[PDB]
Design a protein around this nucleic acid. Structure first.
Ligand SMILES: [K+]
Ligand SMILES: [K+]
Ligand SMILES: [K+]
Ligand SMILES: [K+]
Ligand SMILES: [K+]
Ligand SMILES: [K+]
Ligand SMILES: [K+]
Ligand SMILES: [K+]
Ligand SMILES: [K+]
Ligand SMILES: [K+]
Ligand SMILES: [K+]
Ligand SMILES: [K+]
Ligand SMILES: [K+]
Ligand SMILES: [K+]
Ligand SMILES: [K+]
Ligand SMILES: [K+]
Ligand SMILES: [K+]
Ligand SMILES: [K+]
Ligand SMILES: [K+]
Ligand SMILES: [K+]
Ligand SMILES: [K+]
Ligand SMILES: [K+]
Ligand SMILES: [K+]
Ligand SMILES: [K+]
Ligand SMILES: [K+]
Ligand SMILES: [K+]
Ligand SMILES: [K+]
Ligand SMILES: [K+]
Ligand SMILES: [K+]
Ligand SMILES: [Mg+2]
Ligand SMILES: [Mg+2]
Ligand SMILES: [Mg+2]
Ligand SMILES: [Mg+2]
Ligand SMILES: [Mg+2]
Ligand SMILES: [Mg+2]
Ligand SMILES: [Mg+2]
Ligand SMILES: [Mg+2]
Ligand SMILES: [Mg+2]
Ligand SMILES: [Mg+2]
Ligand SMILES: [Mg+2]
Ligand SMILES: [Mg+2]
Ligand SMILES: [Mg+2]
Ligand SMILES: [Mg+2]
Ligand SMILES: [Mg+2]
Ligand SMILES: [Mg+2]
Ligand SMILES: [Mg+2]
Ligand SMILES: [Mg+2]
Ligand SMILES: [Mg+2]
Ligand SMILES: [Mg+2]
Ligand SMILES: [Mg+2]
Ligand SMILES: [Mg+2]
Ligand SMILES: [Mg+2]
Ligand SMILES: [Mg+2]
Ligand SMILES: [Mg+2]
Ligand SMILES: [Mg+2]
Ligand SMILES: [Mg+2]
Ligand SMILES: [Mg+2]
Ligand SMILES: [Mg+2]
Ligand SMILES: [Mg+2]
Ligand SMILES: [Mg+2]
Ligand SMILES: [Mg+2]
Ligand SMILES: [Mg+2]
Ligand SMILES: [Mg+2]
Ligand SMILES: [Mg+2]
Ligand SMILES: [Mg+2]
Ligand SMILES: [Mg+2]
Ligand SMILES: [Mg+2]
Ligand SMILES: [Mg+2]
Ligand SMILES: [Mg+2]
Ligand SMILES: [Mg+2]
Ligand SMILES: [Zn+2]
Lengths: 122, 114, 53, 125, 206
RNA sequence: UAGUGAACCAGUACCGUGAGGGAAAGGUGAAAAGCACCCCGGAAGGGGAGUGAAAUAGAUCCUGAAACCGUGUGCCUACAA
RNA sequence: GUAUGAGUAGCGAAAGACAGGUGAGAAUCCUGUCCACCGUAUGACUAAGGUUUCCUGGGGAAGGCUCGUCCGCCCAGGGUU
RNA sequence: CUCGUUAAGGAACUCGGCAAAAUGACCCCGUAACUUCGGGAGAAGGGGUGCUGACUUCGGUCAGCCGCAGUGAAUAGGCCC
RNA sequence: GUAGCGAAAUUCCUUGUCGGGUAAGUUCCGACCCGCACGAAAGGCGUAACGAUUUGGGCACUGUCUCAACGAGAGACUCGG
RNA sequence: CACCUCGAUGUCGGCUCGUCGCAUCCUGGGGCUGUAGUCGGUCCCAAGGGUUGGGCUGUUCGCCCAUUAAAGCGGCACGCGAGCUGGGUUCAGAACGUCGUGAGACAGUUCGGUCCCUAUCCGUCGCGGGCGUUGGAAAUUUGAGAGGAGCUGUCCUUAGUACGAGAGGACCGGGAUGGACUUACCGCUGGUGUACCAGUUGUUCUGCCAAGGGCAUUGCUGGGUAGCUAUGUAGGGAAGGGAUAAACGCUGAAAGCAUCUAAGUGUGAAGCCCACCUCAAGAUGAGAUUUCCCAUUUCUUUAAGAAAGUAAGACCCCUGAGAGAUGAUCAGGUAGAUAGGUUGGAAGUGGAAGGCUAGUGAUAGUUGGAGCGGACCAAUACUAAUCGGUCGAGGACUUAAC
């Protein structure tokens, strides 16, 4: 459950390290965003040499959350942190490498490039 | 409640091994990426067992790529091909939530060899 | 908040219509015949259900 | 469920222990409705421990019963004192060895003057 | 199609394809058609159905006389079903869970669990007031209205008794029917406390 | 409720550190003859029995208004603003 | 003087429980047991202040925010070397 | 009203982080700009704390043991620009 | 009207203009000076330390909030006084 | 302007709660277009629903950031302070600029500055008692009327088709899946869970060891049953009719033509009435169906008379929860499983005590998935629902028909 002001790690090497949620897209009054949702965020802390830099307004996709997801089979997945990946408008990640595991729900959300790049999909 | 037990006795599985929280398990979880179906092994320590009868569930935690991941499965889910007890651990409680805080060496569990 | 108008005698009596006691569950004690509350030990003879206690 | 008896948790526990020990000692006591309806269960469970009679039940009961003097007698030209726990495991247990629960009865009496509180007598059958 | 049963409880079921769904177990001992209502006699068409055989000491002479026509023991519950084919039913006929088939879409009617006296925040899901910043307004029902009317409009929702209302859930799925146990497994959850009356009818919307 | 604040143990009771401020409160019956004795009640208080012309003159005692409270009922009243 | 509000607010920080006794009458008084509270005090002395509230034997009119057989209250005696 | 806990988020509340939360004991390391050279400073930021043996130069050290956690409860600074 | 300071506890026009901070800053900080209407003991400018002072930012922390849920106690509720 | 209020009508902004108007922001329908298409512009009908999260500022307003289909305008004492706040305005303190000789003053600024009231009546939200509904009862019911709901995004297909030179790119039609809102529920994820289990500190008590009890916020800490719960789960606003708005007609004269109209006749919207959900015969207009009891006794009186035993039945009282402030509702009262206890289980916890073994020891293993186990499950009359009591009909008249 990611909402406005919620801070997330960056699971890619685009340069940004921590981002702050600005908006939860997908509805006028939508409050919370979960795995597979795209958010407007701001780069609060950036790697010095990265492409993306501090203070830029960016779009990112949630790739793992403390409150994770429930599968049609009745199973659940939860992660130990909330992380997102910065994406271009066409869902292509700004960075080149993904860090840490990723949720399998991104597949049906059609983030195929991120799914492929992920070191592991669960 | 007896009626519920009788109704769900049919779907209760019978190939479940005897495992308790603290035992490392390998879960042959079926996964489908389309038409194709596949078995992905989720191996980790059992952190929680709760519920009863058909509603029983268990949680397995593993640190993958430096990020903890916890998967909760219905004990009698047909989507899990097999549960294989890789190891038995010595734990002093039913719920091992405290492990979520620990990392690496601190999270080690001594083996008992039941 | 305070009474805008004093309550008249009739209105007061109407409100008190339901302000009354009741006496229920009195019946003859099987042992001595004196009245007693049902399901209670008769205070006169000390019996209940045909036995002294 | 269980009643709160207008006390905090610890105070209610202490009051129930006191009343249960008093009922063990005297075998007949006058209390209020709610106090009786809780003491019945507590004392019957103590009696169950007594009927079991093993050391485990002895100590489990000791965790509850008060350390009071159940009775005193003159025997062997000497005074013998029996505590509530000893009475529980020597008399009440063997007494009720054949009864399958329901060792206590409650009789409804007149309400108290100072409160109109519905009073009852609770006693071992 | 309709039937009366008892909300046994809730569990979960694995279906084909391995999906896990929560179901409510509702038991319905064969109900009995006690009376047939017709336009000529009553002005409308419906069938009276009784359920949950009831002890004679719990029944009355008028109730026994009423159920005599059907020749059955006293029933604890009686309800009328409309939108049914009067031709297909007659006094003394039995109705069983087998009337429904797995995958049927039904309306389930119950009496919601009672919550006693409840405040407006819970009873109507209204917003609380701030809990700090000197606020002395926490769980109160808001303003009662404008000054001009010199009164309070009807439907100014306030605290009161919550629950115990007749509630219908539409388009629930009949997961399973066990005729041997007189059981229906209905996907989802249904109103009412366990052992309360439940009414299943063929979904009107469909 | 007048008449001195004070017809009565009043400049008292009471209030205020103090100067000071400052009340309420009369009437059994001709005569106590002030209800011996009995009954209920722990007493109080009553019911008899007595005194008395009168006791609904019984000491809160001459008369006993109104507000207020209660009992019994001749009539009316639960579709009315 | 008496109403209305109204038999409503309030009954002023906190643990009592049972057995026995007393008594017309007991949650409220005495005794007993256990339990619980304070313990740089909620203990032990003293100055001021109060001025008999100290003790013993009775009482339950009024006071005690309930009750009361009890009291720092009332009645009778005594008590400060 | 007083108090305990609370998923995910963590000031988005709000005039205002009001209130609440967090820090808090002792031992060790370490500690900036600026400065009136005294301070800042308990800056900051970190580490240790239980039990049992052996040995101690008596403060320790080595080894072992247990728990989720060792000032195991209570009382004890939030900090910085 | 000098030095010094200047949209200031003083700047109405005014959220002056520019830069920093923020995703976004009428507040805040830095700078400019057309100072409506600063200015040198009703002192000018600066200043270490200090402040239950006013103001802005940050970390930690949290129901403050998204958005409320449960539980304990006192009152409210029923009964007796 | 000065008509009510100065023997007091509380003033901005915000919060909670909304409700109403339509001069309509979106959604719906339509005409014209300098409407190719996609976008639009303007106007007509339309108020059913919805119409946001922040930075700044006491703010309204406004700018900005990021979204949305949209981010409407207004009234209701610029709604709502006996519902809340009190940042601003507007007391007493103090200061700056300015004015004044001065006390002081400034819709000029700045720091700080007590928001009382136990609801009598109406009104509103819920719950009872009485009587009526014309013999007395137990159930089921029709529906006069009333309330609730009413929103919408994206994607796929039709189709890269119609259109367009190209770029670009549809109407209608058919599917999938969301946002917000909302009705229920605890099987799942979690929260809570103060008479569940375990660890642990200090002190104190059970004579001591051992094992335990008291207090320390439930002493603290790790879990957790039922119940209550959302963020968790399931469902909903679906299809469809009738009459219409603007609009479009068809036939048709007045007025040989023309003309939607005068007669006649039709299409037409998230709009109206139904349809969906809920309450509903105190709807005194008091309805309807099935079932049960039966015409008693005495005295008065031809009385629709009175009381007194009843019948069908209801209640008192007692055991309770799925119910609950109390009434009430519902489950039961030995014709018994209503509750307590007991027995057996379950969740839950995590391996009891006493031994045994190993170890100098802390401690580990074993006896043993042990011990304990509130609300959960099933049996069991062992305890308590005993004995009893109260209330409760005999059915008016007129006139059609039979
Ligand atoms: K006289
Ligand atoms: K009268
Ligand atoms: K008065
Ligand atoms: K009164
Ligand atoms: K005395
Ligand atoms: K502000
Ligand atoms: K500092
Ligand atoms: K440690
Ligand atoms: K300190
Ligand atoms: K300037
Ligand atoms: K100035
Ligand atoms: K800027
Ligand atoms: K300062
Ligand atoms: K200060
Ligand atoms: K809290
Ligand atoms: K918020
Ligand atoms: K005025
Ligand atoms: K148009
Ligand atoms: K509208
Ligand atoms: K703001
Ligand atoms: K409005
Ligand atoms: K106010
Ligand atoms: K009025
Ligand atoms: K919990
Ligand atoms: K101890
Ligand atoms: K103690
Ligand atoms: K009726
Ligand atoms: K053992
Ligand atoms: K077990
Ligand atoms: Mg388990
Ligand atoms: Mg305690
Ligand atoms: Mg005792
Ligand atoms: Mg809110
Ligand atoms: Mg009016
Ligand atoms: Mg005078
Ligand atoms: Mg006279
Ligand atoms: Mg007189
Ligand atoms: Mg009428
Ligand atoms: Mg009338
Ligand atoms: Mg009142
Ligand atoms: Mg007191
Ligand atoms: Mg103490
Ligand atoms: Mg101290
Ligand atoms: Mg004395
Ligand atoms: Mg004395
Ligand atoms: Mg008194
Ligand atoms: Mg939280
Ligand atoms: Mg958390
Ligand atoms: Mg803010
Ligand atoms: Mg805000
Ligand atoms: Mg604070
Ligand atoms: Mg500590
Ligand atoms: Mg500026
Ligand atoms: Mg700027
Ligand atoms: Mg000056
Ligand atoms: Mg000068
Ligand atoms: Mg100066
Ligand atoms: Mg009372
Ligand atoms: Mg004039
Ligand atoms: Mg006036
Ligand atoms: Mg219009
Ligand atoms: Mg901020
Ligand atoms: Mg206003
Ligand atoms: Mg007002
Ligand atoms: Mg001057
Ligand atoms: Mg201040
Ligand atoms: Mg749940
Ligand atoms: Mg459950
Ligand atoms: Mg010991
Ligand atoms: Mg049962
Ligand atoms: Zn008797």
């Amino acid at each position: 459950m990611i909402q406005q002001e919620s801070r997330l790690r960056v699971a890619d090497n685009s340069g940004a390290r921590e981002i702050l949620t600005i908006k939860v897209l997908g509805g006028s009054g939508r409050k919370t965003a979960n795995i597979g949702d795209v958010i407007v965020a701001t780069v609060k802390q950036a790697t010095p040499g990265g492409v993306v830099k501090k203070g830029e307004v960016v779009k990112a996709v949630i790739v793992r959350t403390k409150s994770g997801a429930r599968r049609a089979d009745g199973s659940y997945i939860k992660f130990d942190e909330n992380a997102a990946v910065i994406i271009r408008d066409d869902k292509s990640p700004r960075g080149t490498r993904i860090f840490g595991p990723v949720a399998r729900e991104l597949r049906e959300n059609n983030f195929m490039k991120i799914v492929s790049l992920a070191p592991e999909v669960l | 409640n007896p009626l519920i037990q009788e109704l769900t006795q049919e779907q209760l599985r019978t190939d479940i091994p005897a495992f308790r929280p603290g035992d490392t398990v390998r879960v042959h979880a079926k996964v489908v990426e389309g038409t194709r179906e596949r078995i992905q092994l989720f191996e980790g320590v059992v952190i929680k067992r709760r519920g009863a009868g058909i509603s029983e569930t268990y949680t397995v935690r593993k640190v993958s790529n430096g990020v903890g991941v916890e998967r909760t499965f219905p004990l009698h889910t047909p989507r899990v091909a097999q549960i294989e007890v890789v190891r038995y651990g010595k734990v002093r409680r039913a719920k091992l939530y405290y492990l979520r805080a620990l990392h690496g060496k601190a999270a080690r569990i001594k083996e008992i060899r039941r | 908040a305070v009474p805008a108008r004093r309550t008249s005698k009739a209105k007061k009596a109407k409100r008190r219509t339901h302000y009354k006691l009741t006496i229920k569950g009195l019946n003859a004690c099987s042992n001595c015949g004196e009245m007693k509350k049902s399901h209670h030990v008769c205070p006169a003879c000390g019996h209940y259900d045909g036995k002294d206690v | 469920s269980y009643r709160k008896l207008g006390r905090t948790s610890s105070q209610r526990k202490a009051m129930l222990r006191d009343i249960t020990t008093d009922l063990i000692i005297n075998e007949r006591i006058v209390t209020t409705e709610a106090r009786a309806k809780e003491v019945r269960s507590t004392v019957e469970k103590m009696i169950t421990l007594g009927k079991r009679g093993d050391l485990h039940a002895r100590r489990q009961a000791a965790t509850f019963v008060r350390n009071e003097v159940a009775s005193v007698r003159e025997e062997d030209e000497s005074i013998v004192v029996e505590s509530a726990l000893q009475k529980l495991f020597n008399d009440l247990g063997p007494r009720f060895a054949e009864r399958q629960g329901g060792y206590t009865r409650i009789l409804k009496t007149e309400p108290r003057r100072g409160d109109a509180a519905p009073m009852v007598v609770i006693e071992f059958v | 199609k309709g039937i009366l049963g008892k909300k046994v409880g809730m569990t979960q079921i694995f279906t084909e394809s391995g999906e896990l769904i929560p179901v409510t177990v509702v038991e319905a001992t064969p109900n009995v058609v006690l009376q047939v209502k017709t336009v000529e006699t009553d002005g409308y068409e419906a069938i009276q159905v009784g359920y949950q055989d009831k002890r004679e000491v719990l029944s009355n002479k008028p109730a026994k006389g009423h159920v005599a026509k059907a020749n059955t023991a006293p029933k604890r519950f009686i309800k009328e079903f409309k939108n049914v084919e009067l031709g297909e039913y007659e006094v003394g006929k039995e109705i069983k869970v087998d009337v429904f088939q797995a995958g049927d879409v039904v309306d389930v009617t119950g009496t919601t669990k009672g919550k006693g006296f409840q405040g407006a925040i819970k009873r109507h899901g209204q917003s609380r007031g701030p809990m700090s910043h000197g606020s002395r307004y926490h769980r109160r029902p808001g303003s009662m209205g404008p000054v001009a009317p010199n009164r309070v409009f009807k439907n100014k929702r306030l605290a009161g008794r919550m629950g115990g209302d007749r509630v219908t859930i539409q388009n629930l799925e009949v997961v399973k029917v066990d005729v041997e146990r007189n059981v229906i497994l209905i996907k989802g959850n249904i109103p009412g406390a366990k052992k309360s009356l439940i009414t299943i009818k063929s979904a009107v919307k469909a």
